[PDB]
Amino acid sequence: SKVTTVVATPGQGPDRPQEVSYTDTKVIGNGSFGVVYQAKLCDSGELVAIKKVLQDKRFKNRELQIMRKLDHCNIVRLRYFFYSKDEVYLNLVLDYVPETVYRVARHYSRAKQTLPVIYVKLYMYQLFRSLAYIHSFGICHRDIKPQNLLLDPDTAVLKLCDFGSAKQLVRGEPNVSYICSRYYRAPELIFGATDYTSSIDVWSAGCVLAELLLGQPIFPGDSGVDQLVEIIKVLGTPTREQIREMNPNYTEFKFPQIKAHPWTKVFRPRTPPEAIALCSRLLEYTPTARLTPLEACAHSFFDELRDPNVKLPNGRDTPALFNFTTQELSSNPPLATILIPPHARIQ
Numbered sequence: 001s002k003v004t005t006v007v008a009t010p011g012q013g014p015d016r017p018q019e020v021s022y023t024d025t026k027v028i029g030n031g032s033f034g035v036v037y038q039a040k041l042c043d044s045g046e047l048v049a050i051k052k053v054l055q056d057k058r059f060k061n062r063e064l065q066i067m068r069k070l071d072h073c074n075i076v077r078l079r080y081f082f083y084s085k086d087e088v089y090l091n092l093v094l095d096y097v098p099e100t101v102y103r104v105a106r107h108y109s110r111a112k113q114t115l116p117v118i119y120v121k122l123y124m125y126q127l128f129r130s131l132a133y134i135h136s137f138g139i140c141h142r143d144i145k146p147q148n149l150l151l152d153p154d155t156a157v158l159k160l161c162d163f164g165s166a167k168q169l170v171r172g173e174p175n176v177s178y179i180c181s182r183y184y185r186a187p188e189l190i191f192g193a194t195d196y197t198s199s200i201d202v203w204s205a206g207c208v209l210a211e212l213l214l215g216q217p218i219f220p221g222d223s224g225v226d227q228l229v230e231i232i233k234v235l236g237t238p239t240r241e242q243i244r245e246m247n248p249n250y251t252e253f254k255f256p257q258i259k260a261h262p263w264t265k266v267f268r269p270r271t272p273p274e275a276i277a278l279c280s281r282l283l284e285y286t287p288t289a290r291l292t293p294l295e296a297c298a299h300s301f302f303d304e305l306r307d308p309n310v311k312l313p314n315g316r317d318t319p320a321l322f323n324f325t326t327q328e329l330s331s332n333p334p335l336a337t338i339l340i341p342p343h344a345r346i347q
């Protein structure tokens with residue numbers, strides 16, 4: 001009962017500090033992403049995660065200012081923030097969730113068992129949703145992978161986190177190319193591309209999809225150089241025309257020609273055709289040929305989720321999949337027809 005008490009500015013509301021108290025401060029993480037503690041809210045009893053960073057007093061913060069314009073239930077909610085190695089740290093109080101998709105995938109795999117397809121449908125849909133909400137701002141995550149997909153096991157609700165790498169993409173302004181974890185890095189980035197679009201999130205989510213079908217990473221590779229070699233094995237060698245689309249700085253190739261290994265004989269035998277059809281639309285050399293998140297939500301692979309008489313393996317109802325705002329449908333309103341099925345329109 002060693003209660004810390006600070007004054008903290010609410011995350012999405014108006015700029016009006018309150019008093020807040022909590023306890024049970026133990027460390028849960030410490031790495032590239034920063035320094036995170038678990039903690040317990042005195043009043044409610046609820047759990048939280050608290051990220052801590054030395055902040056350059058004379059400057060804004062790119063992570064804080066991105067999270068303060070966000071309120072989506074597939075995105076980890078920022079509750080409060082405040083300040084406090086010698087001088088000035090920034091603190092962010094976040095919703096706590098104990099399991100991840102990576103952890104859950106890992107368990108099925110090492111025991112030599114496949115992830116039931118229903119869980120594959122649930123997880124990607126909610127991800128594509130989460131991508132659609134941020135892409136309607138210009139904000140690109142730039143670190144989609146299974147370890148950044150938090151998950152409630154009993155309910156199935158899933159929440160993207162870690163907006164440390166996230167950035168608002170602007171036409172004409174250059175951006176760094178060595179970014180995202182290697183196995184989930186789009187080929188344009190590899191090629192040196194500097195004015196890439198938010199469709200790099202869509203590539204990465206494709207790599208996550210295939211992983212959940214095979215029970216292991218689709219493109220490993222043992223270096224930044226070897227990562228395009230593992231890709232080429234599957235999609236063959238790209239054309240000068242494809243290489244132009246990714247980066248207009250390459251004219252001559254540096255690695256012999258290979259032909260495309262077909263999609264059907266990459267996975268196992270019983271795999272559903274729409275999983276494979278979808279996967280082909282995500283993993284394309286050409287950025288503009290890849291689907292949009294919202295278009296991905298409307299794929300025929302997710303039709304089972306829009307059934308009314310559908311439940312989880314533990315009997316329960318599925319979480320709400322059809323409470324789309326206008327902001328969320330804003331990039332293509334016509335799709336409402338499909339995204340919201342009849343029974344979810346009940347006046």
Ligand SMILES: CN(C)c1nc2ccc1CCCCn1cc(c3ccccc31)C1=C(C(=O)NC1=O)c1cn(c3ccccc13)CCC2
Pocket residue numbers: 028029030033034036048049051076094095096097098099100147148161162163164
């Ligand atoms: C094993 N393991 C190393 C691991 N790594 C990650 C995710 C989960 C896990 C295991 C689950 C244990 C519970 N667990 C939940 C965590 C968390 C954070 C650190 C350690 C454990 C942890 C949470 C978050 C978050 O936003 N809200 C959370 O509740 C964040 C995840 N990250 C960042 C970064 C910056 C700010 C907040 C958070 C990125 C790290 C990726």
